[PDB]
Amino acid sequence: PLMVKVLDAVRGSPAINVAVHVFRKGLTTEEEFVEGIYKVEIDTKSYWKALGISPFHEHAEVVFTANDSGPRRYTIAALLSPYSYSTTAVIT
Amino acid sequence: PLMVKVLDAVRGSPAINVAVHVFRKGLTTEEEFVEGIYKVEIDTKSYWKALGISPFHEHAEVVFTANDSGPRRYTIAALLSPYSYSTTAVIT
Amino acid sequence: PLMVKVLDAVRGSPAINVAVHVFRKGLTTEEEFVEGIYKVEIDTKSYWKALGISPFHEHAEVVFTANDSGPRRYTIAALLSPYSYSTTAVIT
Amino acid sequence: PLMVKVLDAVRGSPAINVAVHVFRKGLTTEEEFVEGIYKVEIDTKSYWKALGISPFHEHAEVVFTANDSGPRRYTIAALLSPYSYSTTAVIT
Amino acid sequence: PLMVKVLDAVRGSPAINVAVHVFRKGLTTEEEFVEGIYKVEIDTKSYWKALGISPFHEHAEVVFTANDSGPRRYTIAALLSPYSYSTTAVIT
Amino acid sequence: PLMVKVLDAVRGSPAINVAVHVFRKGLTTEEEFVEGIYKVEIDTKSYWKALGISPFHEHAEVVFTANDSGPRRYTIAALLSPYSYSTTAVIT
């Protein structure tokens, strides 16, 4: 008897992000997983990933160059921060 | 008997993002997974991924160049932040 | 007996995004997965992905160039943030 | 007996996005998946994907050039954020 | 008898991020895991990961260069910090 | 009889991040793990990870160069710090 009870009774106005999981039981491999449930990615950069079997195997001249030079701006007043009866403001 | 009960009773006006999962049981491979349930990606860059089997195998001259130089702006006052009875404002 | 009950009773006006999953049981391959349920992608860039088997196998001269230089702007006051009885405003 | 009950009783005027899934059981391949259920993609760019078997196999001179330089603007006051009894306004 | 009870009774308007998990039982491989439940990644950079079996095996001349030089700014007043009855403001 | 009870009764408006886990029972490999539950990564850089079996095996001349020189700024007034009845402000 696996019984899970979450926030069963709520009187009022709560701000919430419920996450409930119940389980009863050649290069990169994954299995039976829960990923990114509430994941938040901002300005995420992947350049060279899982290129392959035998990549650049013989006589490979390679010049790699990452030039991260940008007037970039990110302004998040509430990230994954539920809020009740409040005042949120990005004043810019 | 697998019983899961979530937010069964709500009196009022809550702001919510419910996520409930119940389970009763050549280069990149995945299986039996839950991904991106509420995932939020902003300004995400993948350049060279899973190129293939034998990519650039023989005598490969390669010049790779990433020039991330941009007047880019991202303004999110409430990301995955449910809010009840409040004031949200992006004043720009 | 797999019983799942979510938000069964609601008195009032809640703002919600319900997500409920019940399960009773050559380069890139995937199987039996749930993806992008509420995924939100903004300004997402993939340049070179899964090119193929034997891509650029012999004597390949390659010049790759990413020039991300743009006056781009993204303004989202409420992303995946349900809101009840509130005031949301993008004032720009 | 797989019984799933969601939002069975609603008294009032809630704003909601219900998502319920019940399951009782050469380069890129996928199977038995649920994708893009509520996915929201904004300004998403794929340049070179799944080119094919043996693409650019012999003596290939390639110049690739991405020039992302645009006065582009995206303004969404409520993305996947259901809202009841509120005031949403994109004032620009 | 595995009984889990979380926030069963709420009188008022709390701001919360509930996370409840109940379990009753060639290069990189993973299995049976829960990842990114509420993970928040900001300005995360992966350059060379899982290149492959036999990458640069013979006579490989490689010049790698990361130049992280950017006027980048990130301003988050509330990251994973739920807040009730308060005033949050990014004044810039 | 494994009984777990968390925050069962709440009178008022607390700000909380509940995390409850109940368990009743070729290069890098992992199994049966919970990771990133509330993990927050800011300005995290991985350059050369899991390159592969036999990477740079014979006669490899390699020049690696990381130049982290950026006018980067990160301002988070509340990271994983729930707050009730308070005033949070990033004044810049």
Coordinates of C-alpha atoms in Angstrom, one line a residue:
Chain A
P1 CA 0.0 0.0 0.0
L2 CA 2.0 3.0 -1.3
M3 CA -0.1 6.1 -0.3
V4 CA 1.3 9.6 -1.2
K5 CA -0.7 12.8 -0.2
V6 CA 0.5 16.3 -1.1
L7 CA -1.2 19.6 -0.3
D8 CA -4.5 17.7 0.1
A9 CA -6.2 20.6 1.8
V10 CA -5.6 24.4 0.9
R11 CA -7.6 27.2 2.6
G12 CA -6.6 30.5 0.9
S13 CA -4.6 31.4 -2.2
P14 CA -1.0 29.9 -2.0
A15 CA 1.4 30.2 -5.0
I16 CA 3.0 26.8 -5.5
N17 CA 5.0 24.6 -8.0
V18 CA 4.1 21.0 -7.0
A19 CA 6.4 18.2 -8.2
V20 CA 5.5 14.6 -7.1
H21 CA 7.1 11.4 -8.5
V22 CA 6.0 7.9 -7.3
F23 CA 7.8 4.8 -8.6
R24 CA 6.9 1.2 -7.6
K25 CA 9.1 -1.4 -9.2
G26 CA 28.0 3.9 -28.4
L27 CA 29.4 7.1 -26.7
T28 CA 26.6 8.2 -24.3
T29 CA 23.6 6.2 -23.1
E30 CA 20.9 6.9 -20.4
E31 CA 17.8 4.9 -19.1
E32 CA 14.8 5.2 -16.7
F33 CA 15.4 8.8 -15.7
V34 CA 13.4 11.9 -14.9
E35 CA 15.3 15.1 -16.0
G36 CA 14.5 18.8 -16.5
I37 CA 11.4 18.6 -14.2
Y38 CA 11.5 22.4 -13.5
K39 CA 15.0 22.9 -14.9
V40 CA 15.6 26.6 -16.0
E41 CA 18.7 27.2 -18.3
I42 CA 19.7 30.8 -19.2
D43 CA 22.6 31.6 -21.5
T44 CA 23.8 28.0 -21.7
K45 CA 26.4 27.1 -24.4
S46 CA 27.5 23.7 -25.6
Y47 CA 30.1 23.8 -28.4
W48 CA 31.6 20.4 -29.2
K49 CA 29.6 17.4 -27.7
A50 CA 29.3 13.7 -28.8
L51 CA 31.2 14.3 -32.1
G52 CA 31.1 10.6 -32.9
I53 CA 33.1 7.4 -33.2
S54 CA 36.6 8.0 -34.9
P55 CA 36.2 11.8 -35.2
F56 CA 39.5 13.4 -36.5
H57 CA 41.1 9.9 -36.4
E58 CA 44.2 10.6 -38.7
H59 CA 46.3 13.7 -39.6
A60 CA 43.8 16.2 -38.2
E61 CA 44.9 19.9 -38.0
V62 CA 42.1 21.6 -35.9
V63 CA 41.8 25.3 -34.8
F64 CA 38.9 25.8 -32.3
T65 CA 38.1 29.3 -31.2
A66 CA 35.3 30.5 -28.8
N67 CA 35.0 34.3 -28.6
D68 CA 32.3 35.1 -26.0
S69 CA 32.3 39.0 -26.2
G70 CA 28.7 40.3 -26.1
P71 CA 26.9 43.2 -24.5
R72 CA 24.2 40.7 -23.3
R73 CA 21.9 41.4 -20.3
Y74 CA 19.4 39.1 -18.5
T75 CA 17.0 40.5 -15.9
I76 CA 14.6 38.0 -14.1
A77 CA 13.0 39.4 -10.9
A78 CA 11.4 36.0 -10.0
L79 CA 12.9 32.8 -11.3
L80 CA 11.2 29.6 -9.8
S81 CA 10.2 31.9 -6.9
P82 CA 6.3 31.6 -6.6
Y83 CA 5.0 34.7 -4.7
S84 CA 1.6 35.5 -3.1
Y85 CA 0.2 38.9 -2.0
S86 CA 3.5 40.6 -3.1
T87 CA 4.8 43.2 -5.6
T88 CA 7.4 42.1 -8.2
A89 CA 8.8 44.7 -10.6
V90 CA 11.8 44.8 -13.0
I91 CA 12.3 48.6 -13.1
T92 CA 15.0 49.3 -15.8
Chain B
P1 CA -2.7 -0.4 -4.1
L2 CA -0.7 2.7 -5.3
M3 CA -2.8 5.8 -4.3
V4 CA -1.5 9.3 -5.1
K5 CA -3.6 12.4 -4.0
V6 CA -2.4 15.9 -4.9
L7 CA -4.2 19.2 -4.1
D8 CA -7.4 17.2 -3.7
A9 CA -9.2 20.1 -2.0
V10 CA -8.6 23.9 -2.8
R11 CA -10.7 26.6 -1.1
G12 CA -9.8 30.0 -2.7
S13 CA -7.7 31.0 -5.8
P14 CA -4.2 29.5 -5.6
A15 CA -1.8 29.9 -8.6
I16 CA -0.1 26.5 -9.2
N17 CA 1.9 24.4 -11.7
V18 CA 1.1 20.7 -10.7
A19 CA 3.5 18.0 -12.0
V20 CA 2.6 14.4 -10.9
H21 CA 4.2 11.2 -12.4
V22 CA 3.2 7.7 -11.2
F23 CA 5.1 4.7 -12.6
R24 CA 4.3 1.1 -11.6
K25 CA 6.5 -1.5 -13.3
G26 CA 25.3 4.4 -32.4
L27 CA 26.6 7.6 -30.6
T28 CA 23.8 8.6 -28.2
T29 CA 20.8 6.5 -27.1
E30 CA 18.1 7.1 -24.4
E31 CA 15.0 5.1 -23.1
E32 CA 12.1 5.2 -20.7
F33 CA 12.6 8.9 -19.6
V34 CA 10.5 12.0 -18.8
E35 CA 12.3 15.2 -19.9
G36 CA 11.5 18.9 -20.3
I37 CA 8.4 18.6 -18.0
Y38 CA 8.5 22.4 -17.2
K39 CA 12.0 23.0 -18.7
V40 CA 12.5 26.7 -19.7
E41 CA 15.6 27.3 -22.0
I42 CA 16.5 31.0 -22.8
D43 CA 19.5 31.9 -25.1
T44 CA 20.7 28.3 -25.4
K45 CA 23.3 27.5 -28.1
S46 CA 24.5 24.1 -29.3
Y47 CA 27.1 24.3 -32.1
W48 CA 28.6 20.9 -32.9
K49 CA 26.7 17.9 -31.5
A50 CA 26.4 14.2 -32.6
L51 CA 28.3 14.9 -35.9
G52 CA 28.3 11.2 -36.8
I53 CA 30.3 8.0 -37.1
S54 CA 33.8 8.7 -38.8
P55 CA 33.3 12.5 -39.1
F56 CA 36.6 14.2 -40.3
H57 CA 38.3 10.7 -40.4
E58 CA 41.3 11.5 -42.6
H59 CA 43.4 14.6 -43.4
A60 CA 40.8 17.1 -42.1
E61 CA 41.9 20.8 -41.8
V62 CA 39.1 22.4 -39.7
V63 CA 38.8 26.0 -38.5
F64 CA 35.8 26.5 -36.0
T65 CA 34.9 30.0 -34.8
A66 CA 32.2 31.1 -32.4
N67 CA 31.8 34.9 -32.2
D68 CA 29.1 35.6 -29.6
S69 CA 29.0 39.5 -29.7
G70 CA 25.4 40.7 -29.6
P71 CA 23.5 43.6 -28.0
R72 CA 20.9 41.0 -26.8
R73 CA 18.5 41.7 -23.8
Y74 CA 16.1 39.3 -22.0
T75 CA 13.7 40.6 -19.4
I76 CA 11.3 38.1 -17.6
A77 CA 9.7 39.4 -14.4
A78 CA 8.1 36.0 -13.5
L79 CA 9.7 32.7 -14.9
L80 CA 8.1 29.6 -13.5
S81 CA 7.0 31.7 -10.5
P82 CA 3.2 31.4 -10.2
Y83 CA 1.8 34.5 -8.3
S84 CA -1.6 35.1 -6.7
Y85 CA -3.1 38.5 -5.5
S86 CA 0.2 40.3 -6.6
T87 CA 1.5 43.0 -9.0
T88 CA 4.0 41.9 -11.6
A89 CA 5.4 44.6 -14.0
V90 CA 8.4 44.7 -16.4
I91 CA 8.8 48.6 -16.5
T92 CA 11.5 49.3 -19.1
Chain C
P1 CA -5.3 -0.8 -8.1
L2 CA -3.4 2.4 -9.3
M3 CA -5.6 5.4 -8.3
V4 CA -4.3 8.9 -9.0
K5 CA -6.4 12.0 -7.9
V6 CA -5.3 15.6 -8.8
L7 CA -7.1 18.8 -7.9
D8 CA -10.3 16.8 -7.5
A9 CA -12.2 19.6 -5.7
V10 CA -11.6 23.4 -6.5
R11 CA -13.8 26.1 -4.8
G12 CA -12.9 29.5 -6.3
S13 CA -10.9 30.6 -9.4
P14 CA -7.3 29.1 -9.3
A15 CA -4.9 29.6 -12.3
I16 CA -3.2 26.3 -12.9
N17 CA -1.1 24.2 -15.5
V18 CA -1.9 20.5 -14.5
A19 CA 0.5 17.8 -15.8
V20 CA -0.3 14.2 -14.8
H21 CA 1.4 11.1 -16.4
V22 CA 0.4 7.6 -15.2
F23 CA 2.4 4.6 -16.6
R24 CA 1.6 0.9 -15.7
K25 CA 3.9 -1.6 -17.4
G26 CA 22.6 4.9 -36.4
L27 CA 23.8 8.0 -34.6
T28 CA 21.0 9.0 -32.2
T29 CA 18.0 6.9 -31.1
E30 CA 15.3 7.4 -28.4
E31 CA 12.3 5.3 -27.1
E32 CA 9.3 5.3 -24.7
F33 CA 9.8 9.0 -23.5
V34 CA 7.7 12.0 -22.7
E35 CA 9.4 15.2 -23.7
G36 CA 8.5 19.0 -24.1
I37 CA 5.4 18.6 -21.8
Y38 CA 5.4 22.3 -21.0
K39 CA 8.9 23.1 -22.4
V40 CA 9.4 26.8 -23.4
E41 CA 12.4 27.5 -25.6
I42 CA 13.4 31.2 -26.4
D43 CA 16.3 32.2 -28.7
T44 CA 17.6 28.6 -29.0
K45 CA 20.2 27.9 -31.8
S46 CA 21.4 24.5 -33.1
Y47 CA 24.0 24.8 -35.9
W48 CA 25.6 21.4 -36.7
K49 CA 23.7 18.4 -35.3
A50 CA 23.5 14.7 -36.5
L51 CA 25.4 15.5 -39.8
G52 CA 25.4 11.8 -40.7
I53 CA 27.5 8.6 -41.1
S54 CA 31.0 9.4 -42.8
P55 CA 30.5 13.2 -43.0
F56 CA 33.7 15.0 -44.2
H57 CA 35.4 11.6 -44.3
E58 CA 38.5 12.4 -46.5
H59 CA 40.5 15.6 -47.3
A60 CA 37.9 18.0 -45.9
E61 CA 38.8 21.6 -45.5
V62 CA 36.1 23.2 -43.4
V63 CA 35.7 26.8 -42.2
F64 CA 32.7 27.2 -39.7
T65 CA 31.8 30.7 -38.5
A66 CA 29.0 31.7 -36.0
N67 CA 28.6 35.5 -35.7
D68 CA 25.8 36.1 -33.1
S69 CA 25.7 40.0 -33.2
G70 CA 22.1 41.2 -33.1
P71 CA 20.1 44.0 -31.4
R72 CA 17.6 41.3 -30.3
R73 CA 15.2 41.9 -27.3
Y74 CA 12.8 39.4 -25.5
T75 CA 10.4 40.7 -22.8
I76 CA 8.1 38.1 -21.2
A77 CA 6.4 39.3 -17.9
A78 CA 4.9 35.9 -17.1
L79 CA 6.5 32.7 -18.5
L80 CA 4.9 29.5 -17.1
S81 CA 3.8 31.6 -14.1
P82 CA 0.0 31.2 -13.8
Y83 CA -1.4 34.2 -11.9
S84 CA -4.8 34.8 -10.2
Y85 CA -6.3 38.2 -9.0
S86 CA -3.2 40.0 -10.1
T87 CA -1.9 42.8 -12.5
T88 CA 0.7 41.8 -15.1
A89 CA 2.0 44.5 -17.4
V90 CA 5.0 44.7 -19.9
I91 CA 5.4 48.5 -19.9
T92 CA 8.1 49.4 -22.5
Chain D
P1 CA -7.9 -1.1 -12.2
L2 CA -6.1 2.1 -13.4
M3 CA -8.3 5.0 -12.3
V4 CA -7.1 8.6 -13.0
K5 CA -9.3 11.6 -11.8
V6 CA -8.2 15.2 -12.6
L7 CA -10.1 18.4 -11.7
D8 CA -13.3 16.3 -11.4
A9 CA -15.2 19.1 -9.5
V10 CA -14.7 22.9 -10.3
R11 CA -16.8 25.5 -8.5
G12 CA -16.0 29.0 -10.0
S13 CA -14.0 30.1 -13.0
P14 CA -10.4 28.7 -12.9
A15 CA -8.0 29.3 -15.9
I16 CA -6.3 26.0 -16.6
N17 CA -4.2 24.0 -19.2
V18 CA -4.9 20.3 -18.3
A19 CA -2.4 17.7 -19.6
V20 CA -3.2 14.0 -18.7
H21 CA -1.5 11.0 -20.3
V22 CA -2.4 7.4 -19.1
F23 CA -0.4 4.5 -20.6
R24 CA -1.1 0.8 -19.7
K25 CA 1.2 -1.7 -21.5
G26 CA 19.8 5.4 -40.4
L27 CA 21.0 8.5 -38.6
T28 CA 18.2 9.4 -36.1
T29 CA 15.2 7.2 -35.0
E30 CA 12.5 7.6 -32.3
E31 CA 9.5 5.5 -31.1
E32 CA 6.6 5.5 -28.7
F33 CA 7.0 9.1 -27.5
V34 CA 4.8 12.1 -26.6
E35 CA 6.5 15.3 -27.6
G36 CA 5.5 19.1 -27.9
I37 CA 2.5 18.6 -25.6
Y38 CA 2.4 22.3 -24.7
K39 CA 5.9 23.2 -26.1
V40 CA 6.3 26.8 -27.1
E41 CA 9.3 27.7 -29.3
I42 CA 10.2 31.4 -30.0
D43 CA 13.1 32.5 -32.3
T44 CA 14.4 28.9 -32.7
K45 CA 17.0 28.3 -35.4
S46 CA 18.3 25.0 -36.8
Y47 CA 20.9 25.4 -39.6
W48 CA 22.6 22.0 -40.5
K49 CA 20.7 18.9 -39.1
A50 CA 20.6 15.2 -40.4
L51 CA 22.5 16.1 -43.6
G52 CA 22.6 12.4 -44.6
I53 CA 24.7 9.3 -45.0
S54 CA 28.1 10.1 -46.7
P55 CA 27.6 14.0 -46.9
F56 CA 30.8 15.8 -48.1
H57 CA 32.6 12.4 -48.2
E58 CA 35.6 13.3 -50.4
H59 CA 37.6 16.5 -51.2
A60 CA 34.9 18.8 -49.7
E61 CA 35.8 22.5 -49.3
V62 CA 33.0 24.0 -47.1
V63 CA 32.6 27.6 -45.9
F64 CA 29.6 27.9 -43.4
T65 CA 28.6 31.3 -42.1
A66 CA 25.8 32.3 -39.7
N67 CA 25.3 36.1 -39.3
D68 CA 22.6 36.6 -36.7
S69 CA 22.4 40.5 -36.7
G70 CA 18.7 41.6 -36.6
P71 CA 16.7 44.4 -34.8
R72 CA 14.2 41.7 -33.8
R73 CA 11.9 42.1 -30.8
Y74 CA 9.5 39.6 -29.0
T75 CA 7.0 40.8 -26.3
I76 CA 4.8 38.1 -24.7
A77 CA 3.1 39.3 -21.4
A78 CA 1.6 35.8 -20.6
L79 CA 3.3 32.7 -22.1
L80 CA 1.8 29.4 -20.8
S81 CA 0.6 31.5 -17.7
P82 CA -3.2 31.0 -17.5
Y83 CA -4.6 34.0 -15.4
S84 CA -8.1 34.5 -13.8
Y85 CA -9.6 37.8 -12.6
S86 CA -6.5 39.7 -13.6
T87 CA -5.2 42.5 -15.9
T88 CA -2.6 41.6 -18.6
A89 CA -1.3 44.4 -20.8
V90 CA 1.6 44.7 -23.3
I91 CA 1.9 48.5 -23.2
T92 CA 4.6 49.5 -25.8
Chain E
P1 CA 2.7 0.4 4.1
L2 CA 4.7 3.4 2.7
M3 CA 2.7 6.5 3.7
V4 CA 4.1 10.0 2.8
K5 CA 2.1 13.2 3.7
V6 CA 3.4 16.7 2.7
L7 CA 1.8 20.1 3.5
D8 CA -1.5 18.2 3.9
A9 CA -3.2 21.2 5.6
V10 CA -2.5 24.9 4.6
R11 CA -4.5 27.7 6.2
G12 CA -3.5 31.0 4.5
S13 CA -1.4 31.9 1.4
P14 CA 2.1 30.3 1.6
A15 CA 4.5 30.5 -1.4
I16 CA 6.1 27.1 -1.9
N17 CA 8.0 24.8 -4.3
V18 CA 7.1 21.2 -3.2
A19 CA 9.4 18.4 -4.4
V20 CA 8.4 14.8 -3.2
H21 CA 9.9 11.6 -4.6
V22 CA 8.8 8.1 -3.3
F23 CA 10.6 5.0 -4.6
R24 CA 9.6 1.4 -3.5
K25 CA 11.8 -1.3 -5.1
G26 CA 30.8 3.4 -24.3
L27 CA 32.1 6.6 -22.7
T28 CA 29.4 7.9 -20.3
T29 CA 26.3 5.9 -19.1
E30 CA 23.6 6.6 -16.5
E31 CA 20.5 4.8 -15.1
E32 CA 17.6 5.1 -12.7
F33 CA 18.2 8.7 -11.7
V34 CA 16.2 11.9 -11.0
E35 CA 18.2 15.0 -12.2
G36 CA 17.4 18.7 -12.7
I37 CA 14.3 18.6 -10.4
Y38 CA 14.5 22.4 -9.7
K39 CA 18.0 22.9 -11.2
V40 CA 18.7 26.5 -12.3
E41 CA 21.8 27.0 -14.6
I42 CA 22.9 30.6 -15.5
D43 CA 25.8 31.4 -17.9
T44 CA 26.9 27.7 -18.0
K45 CA 29.5 26.8 -20.7
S46 CA 30.6 23.3 -21.9
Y47 CA 33.2 23.3 -24.7
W48 CA 34.6 19.8 -25.4
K49 CA 32.6 16.9 -23.9
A50 CA 32.2 13.2 -24.9
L51 CA 34.1 13.8 -28.2
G52 CA 34.0 10.0 -29.0
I53 CA 35.9 6.7 -29.2
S54 CA 39.4 7.3 -30.9
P55 CA 39.1 11.1 -31.3
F56 CA 42.4 12.7 -32.6
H57 CA 44.0 9.2 -32.5
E58 CA 47.0 9.7 -34.8
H59 CA 49.2 12.8 -35.7
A60 CA 46.7 15.4 -34.4
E61 CA 47.8 19.0 -34.2
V62 CA 45.2 20.8 -32.1
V63 CA 44.9 24.5 -31.1
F64 CA 42.0 25.1 -28.6
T65 CA 41.2 28.7 -27.5
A66 CA 38.5 29.9 -25.1
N67 CA 38.3 33.8 -25.0
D68 CA 35.5 34.6 -22.4
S69 CA 35.6 38.5 -22.7
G70 CA 32.0 39.8 -22.6
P71 CA 30.2 42.9 -21.1
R72 CA 27.6 40.3 -19.8
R73 CA 25.2 41.2 -16.9
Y74 CA 22.7 38.9 -15.0
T75 CA 20.3 40.4 -12.4
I76 CA 17.9 38.0 -10.6
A77 CA 16.3 39.4 -7.4
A78 CA 14.6 36.1 -6.4
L79 CA 16.1 32.8 -7.7
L80 CA 14.3 29.7 -6.2
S81 CA 13.3 32.0 -3.2
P82 CA 9.5 31.8 -3.0
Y83 CA 8.2 35.0 -1.2
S84 CA 4.9 35.8 0.4
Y85 CA 3.5 39.2 1.5
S86 CA 6.8 40.9 0.4
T87 CA 8.2 43.5 -2.1
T88 CA 10.7 42.2 -4.7
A89 CA 12.2 44.8 -7.1
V90 CA 15.2 44.8 -9.6
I91 CA 15.7 48.6 -9.7
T92 CA 18.4 49.2 -12.4
Chain F
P1 CA 5.3 0.8 8.1
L2 CA 7.4 3.8 6.7
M3 CA 5.4 7.0 7.6
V4 CA 6.9 10.4 6.7
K5 CA 5.0 13.6 7.6
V6 CA 6.3 17.0 6.5
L7 CA 4.8 20.5 7.2
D8 CA 1.4 18.6 7.7
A9 CA -0.2 21.7 9.3
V10 CA 0.6 25.4 8.3
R11 CA -1.4 28.3 9.9
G12 CA -0.3 31.5 8.2
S13 CA 1.8 32.3 5.0
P14 CA 5.3 30.7 5.2
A15 CA 7.7 30.8 2.2
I16 CA 9.2 27.3 1.8
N17 CA 11.1 25.0 -0.6
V18 CA 10.1 21.4 0.6
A19 CA 12.3 18.5 -0.6
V20 CA 11.3 15.0 0.6
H21 CA 12.7 11.7 -0.7
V22 CA 11.5 8.3 0.6
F23 CA 13.3 5.2 -0.6
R24 CA 12.3 1.6 0.5
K25 CA 14.4 -1.2 -1.1
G26 CA 33.5 3.0 -20.3
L27 CA 34.9 6.2 -18.7
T28 CA 32.2 7.5 -16.3
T29 CA 29.1 5.6 -15.1
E30 CA 26.4 6.4 -12.5
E31 CA 23.3 4.6 -11.1
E32 CA 20.3 5.0 -8.7
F33 CA 21.0 8.6 -7.8
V34 CA 19.1 11.9 -7.1
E35 CA 21.1 14.9 -8.3
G36 CA 20.4 18.7 -8.9
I37 CA 17.3 18.6 -6.6
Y38 CA 17.5 22.4 -6.0
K39 CA 21.1 22.8 -7.4
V40 CA 21.8 26.4 -8.6
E41 CA 24.9 26.8 -10.9
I42 CA 26.0 30.4 -11.9
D43 CA 29.0 31.1 -14.3
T44 CA 30.0 27.4 -14.3
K45 CA 32.6 26.4 -17.0
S46 CA 33.6 22.9 -18.1
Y47 CA 36.2 22.8 -20.9
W48 CA 37.6 19.3 -21.6
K49 CA 35.5 16.4 -20.0
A50 CA 35.1 12.7 -21.0
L51 CA 37.0 13.2 -24.3
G52 CA 36.8 9.5 -25.0
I53 CA 38.7 6.1 -25.2
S54 CA 42.1 6.6 -26.9
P55 CA 41.9 10.5 -27.3
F56 CA 45.2 11.9 -28.7
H57 CA 46.8 8.4 -28.5
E58 CA 49.8 8.9 -30.8
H59 CA 52.1 11.9 -31.8
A60 CA 49.6 14.5 -30.5
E61 CA 50.8 18.1 -30.4
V62 CA 48.1 20.0 -28.3
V63 CA 48.0 23.7 -27.3
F64 CA 45.1 24.4 -24.9
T65 CA 44.3 28.0 -23.8
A66 CA 41.6 29.3 -21.5
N67 CA 41.5 33.2 -21.4
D68 CA 38.8 34.1 -18.8
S69 CA 38.9 37.9 -19.1
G70 CA 35.3 39.4 -19.1
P71 CA 33.6 42.5 -17.6
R72 CA 30.9 40.0 -16.3
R73 CA 28.5 40.9 -13.4
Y74 CA 26.0 38.7 -11.5
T75 CA 23.6 40.3 -8.9
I76 CA 21.2 37.9 -7.1
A77 CA 19.6 39.4 -3.9
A78 CA 17.9 36.2 -2.9
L79 CA 19.3 32.8 -4.1
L80 CA 17.5 29.8 -2.6
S81 CA 16.5 32.1 0.4
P82 CA 12.7 32.0 0.6
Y83 CA 11.5 35.2 2.4
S84 CA 8.1 36.1 4.0
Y85 CA 6.8 39.6 5.0
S86 CA 10.1 41.2 3.9
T87 CA 11.5 43.7 1.3
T88 CA 14.1 42.4 -1.2
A89 CA 15.6 44.9 -3.7
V90 CA 18.5 44.8 -6.2
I91 CA 19.2 48.6 -6.4
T92 CA 21.9 49.1 -9.0

